[model samples]
Target: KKLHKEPATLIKAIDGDTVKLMYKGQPMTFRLLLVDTPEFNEKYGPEASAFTKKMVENAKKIEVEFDKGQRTDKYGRGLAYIYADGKMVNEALVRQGLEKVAYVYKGNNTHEQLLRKAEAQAKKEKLNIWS
Candidate 1:
């Protein structure tokens, strides 16, 4: 049970929800599958990173499942579903409104419908990321 030292080590924190992870000894960069916060250069960028890290930085023993469709963005990275304990971190972060769900494109996007609902809650509650 590693605490902060997770497999998805932080190689580079590019922006809010997007970061480069040392995925399986490869220099991989990902869009933090599912949730999407503002760009670090954007408004509330620092806040978004702070909020995201607060929830996931030291979170360990995660169980993730890679979804279908586009795994990587235009950039090459192992896009995956993140889970800690038994909770889906991706959905959770966005649901909390600390991050935004980046983009929704066609192709095996099963989480589409529920994602809208979660995002709405995040916006409605004015979770930290939005505010």
Candidate 2:
């Protein structure tokens, strides 16, 4: 099935795995799907946040893709996979070892394989948290 991606404008990178975006001209918070990052006070958390901020801030285009299964979390925040200049931000975080593949529910694992591969590469390189 073809994924439908909606273009969004980044309002802020709330954390490594969370961001505020302007979608359809309305500001909304989105939680990145299939990945998790540490909290602000946790180890490596700052770096992860910084990395996400930098990437999103520098991107000329940003997009969010909602999974076919669940579109929002229990808190009502939109759940999606972010793309910054066509690169998968979720996978990029895992590649940097600042985040890990997580919260993969059945029918909601759109990019699970890609994320897992990136996690493996980061683990092998002992980057960030993997160190």
Candidate 3:
């Protein structure tokens, strides 16, 4: 099977876990699948937002990779893994302690092992939000 992806431009980084982007001609927002970052306006929220900004702002290219299991969240935003400069931004956030793996989801697990492992390591190592 082939992966489904589309070009996107960052319109806003809502927080470490959410963002608004321009997908094709549509201005779409996404809840970064598999990870939940600190809420903005709360503890460490600005840092998370800044961290995500640093990651996405410098990307040479941005791609929104839609998951096969579920496409939209209850909020109606597309659920996706964002790739910036070919790196999975979702995983990157977790690895950097900017986000945590979601405990509840409306979609099937995608790379649950990898995310869980990363989350463990991040917490164990006392990375950003985890510390």
Candidate 4:
């Protein structure tokens, strides 16, 4: 399926790697692509969420770019690389060590490599989660 990109307004920061946003006048939740932050109850989980929230709060813009890899996951949440203040949210998560790149969905989108690179740098620098 061909994916569509649209500007979205953040409704909530669900977690370190997931968020709720208003799209098309409807509210939707999107799972940030390529990164998996610690669960809400896990170690450093709250910090991860806080970091994500900080980024969201600081963003001057937010957009959701749905992907052709898979429009929605098995749980029905949209799959996307959310952009907050012009930076991909997933990459930001990984770069900050609040999350790590994990599942790679099959698609033509070009961000997986960038995500991987961000993760590598964070891991090398022993950033947040990597510490």
Candidate 5:
């Protein structure tokens, strides 16, 4: 599921989609949940970045998870699947169409079932992102 190494120090949000923090006595990084928001790829990346920054800037506690991956990505960035209050925020973004599902390794679909369910629920609610 998810693990909390210790309390998090949200030193800064580099952008809406990325954060600078301290976790377990080490420099920490947070990649936004399910919503990649096209930050690096989208024409409107600024909007997505701002939105993500606002959401996490003041987070008092942070929770992290990994989807059959490693402690970090190839670039040495910590890689993870994330959640907040037991809710998979990653799936929330997918339902909103902010991020495209990524497999990167192993196979992601088999592991994304819960995320799919959440997306379905968001669609049923007529979230505009799904439109």
Candidate 6:
């Protein structure tokens, strides 16, 4: 399926796995697809949030891509893949050991292997949560 991609502007990083963005002139909250980060009060959570925030802040451009399966959660926030300066934020979090590859739906497995490979790298290096 052809993916719908669009440029976005960061409003805030709600946590490692969640961000608020301005897309198409509308403010929206997006939950990173196929990844989960620790809560703000959990171990390494603060670091995860900070990392996400910093990446977005330093990015020259940001973009969002919706999944083919589910587009939103129970709360109606968008489910998407986010890119900052061409780097995928979801995979980066797992590679840094700050988040895990999770909440994957069968139809949303487009980047499953990508995320799993990142997780393995983090685990091998014993970084952050992996430590």
Compared with the true structure, all predictions reach lDDT values of 0.62, 0.90, 0.79, 0.79, 0.54, 0.88
Clashes by residue pair, model 4: none
Worst 10 residues of 1 by lDDT: 1-10
Q: lDDT by residue for model 6 over 14-113, one digit each (tens)?
A: 8888899998899999999988764443688889899999998899999999878888889999999999998999999999999988887887778899
Local accuracy of candidate 1 as per-residue lDDT tens digits, 17-131: 6656666677776666656656663666676676556555665544335566777766666566655465666676678776777667665355666677898997888866656
Q: Give the per-residue lDDT of model 2 (tens digit) for 1-131.
A: 96788999999889888999999999999999988864443588888889999999999999999888888889989999999999999999999899988899986897999899999999999988887
**After superposing candidate 1, which stretches have Cα over 4 Å from the reference?**
1-14, 38-41, 128-131
Best by TM-score: 2
Worst 10 residues of 5 by lDDT: 102-111
What candidate 2 gets wrong by more than 4 Å, as runs, is: 38-41
Between candidates 2 and 3, which one is better according to lDDT?
A: 2
Count of clashes in candidate 4: 0
How far does residue 112 in candidate 2 sit from its true spot (Å)? Answer: 0.4
- Winner by lDDT: 2
The collision pairs in model 2 are none
lDDT of 4 by residue, 1-131 (tens): 44456788888997888888888799988888787855552566788788788877778888888766787889989888888777777887888787887777678355888888988998999987777
Candidate structures ordered by TM-score, highest first: 2, 6, 4, 3, 1, 5
CA RMSD of each candidate after superposition: 5.6, 1.8, 2.5, 2.8, 3.9, 1.9
Of 2 and 5, the candidate ahead on lDDT is 2
Per-residue lDDT tens digits of candidate 3, residues 1-131? 54566899989888777888998888988888888755552566777788788888888888998766778877899888898988888888788787788744544465566788888999999988788
> Which parts of model 3 have CA positions greater than 4 angstroms off?
38-42, 103-107
TM-score of each: 0.69, 0.94, 0.85, 0.87, 0.65, 0.92
Model 5 / residue 7 / CA error / Å = 3.8
Task: List residue ranges in candidate 5 displaced over 4 A.
Answer: 1-6, 15-17, 32-44, 84-87, 107-111, 120-130
State model 6's lDDT.
0.88
